[PDB]
Design a protein around this ligand. Structure first.
Ligand SMILES: CCS(=O)(=O)Oc1ccc(OC)c(-c2c[nH]c3ncc(-c4cncc(C(=O)N(C)C)c4)cc23)c1
Length: 267
């Protein structure tokens, strides 16, 4: 913590970024380096939660997870300083891309990177709880990094039970979570599949036109999204594997990763 600790004067805010809360495009003066800074203002997030988030992130070290650069946690306002990803989020990136550049191989590459980060989180006993395209970031040369959020500590064989009155992103949310507010790394696997669908559709919204009130009812009757146009059958089977009712029957991120890596190497 003292090694990550920084003076707020080391950073100059440049631009405000707004669906994420209080996140700014800042400049780390010393290195003339563009950075991203999360600020705590108006008690939008509780202090102790904000601090734990910063304490957790400094344990994270993976090429596909947004890297912590430093923190300002002595005098309010409190800062979290992370690396800046040039091209924004994966959802808007995919929607606005040149699909001749961002082709099938690049889609494969994007999934391999994400599954890599979640394989890491799987091994280090963490869960994400909001895996989606909007929460993935894109750098140069089709580099993708999963947002360090927002991570909770949880042993692989345990279950996080969410607070009461908690509202989830229903179309990304596993059945066990929708019904009993239970979360697992296997529920993150579910979300990955929905993310996997967003990639193949280049950013289309999931379960199109389907009402959120009738999603869980559809899921328990074994309804799943159809294979997108152009999607390899091998990819849809992984999607389907991620979308199985019993989380025990859902593949591990380690297994998912090897699958996509093999598909990526073989292309
Ligand atoms: C993980 C640490 S943190 O969770 O504690 O703080 C957060 C929280 C959320 C973040 O964005 C996902 C980040 C972030 C880190 N690095 C980043 N680089 C770039 C951008 C970004 C730039 N421009 C446009 C967009 C965009 O597409 N918009 C719709 C705005 C996004 C955001 C970030 C950091």
């Amino acid at each position: 913590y003292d090694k990550w600790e920084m003076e707020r004067t080391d950073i100059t805010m440049k631009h405000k970024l707004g669906q994420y809360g209080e996140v700014y495009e800042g400049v780390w003066k010393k290195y003339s380096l563009t950075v991203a800074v999360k600020t705590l203002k108006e008690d939008t997030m509780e202090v102790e939660e904000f601090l734990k988030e910063a304490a957790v992130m400094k344990e994270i070290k993976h090429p596909n997870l947004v890297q912590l650069l430093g923190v300002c946690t002595r005098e309010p306002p409190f800062y979290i300083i992370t690396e800046f990803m040039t091209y924004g989020n994966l959802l808007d990136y995919l929607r606005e891309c040149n699909r001749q550049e961002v082709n099938a191989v690049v889609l494969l590459y994007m999934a391999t990177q994400i599954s890599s980060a979640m394989e890491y989180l799987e091994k280090k006993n963490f869960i994400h709880r909001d895996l989606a395209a909007r929460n993935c970031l894109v750098g140069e040369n089709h580099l993708v990094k999963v947002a360090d959020f927002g991570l909770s500590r949880l042993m692989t064989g345990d279950t996080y039970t969410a607070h009461a009155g908690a509202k989830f992103p229903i179309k990304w949310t596993a059945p066990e979570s929708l019904a009993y507010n239970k979360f697992s790394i296997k529920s993150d696997v579910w979300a990955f599949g929905v993310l996997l669908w967003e990639i193949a559709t280049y950013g289309m919204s999931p379960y199109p036109g389907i009402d959120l009130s009738q999603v869980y009812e559809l899921l328990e009757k074994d309804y799943r999204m159809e294979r997108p146009e152009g999607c390899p059958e091998k990819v849809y089977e992984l999607m389907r594997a991620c979308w199985q009712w019993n989380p025990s029957d859902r593949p591990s991120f380690a297994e998912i990763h090897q699958a996509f890596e093999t598909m990526f190497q073989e292309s």
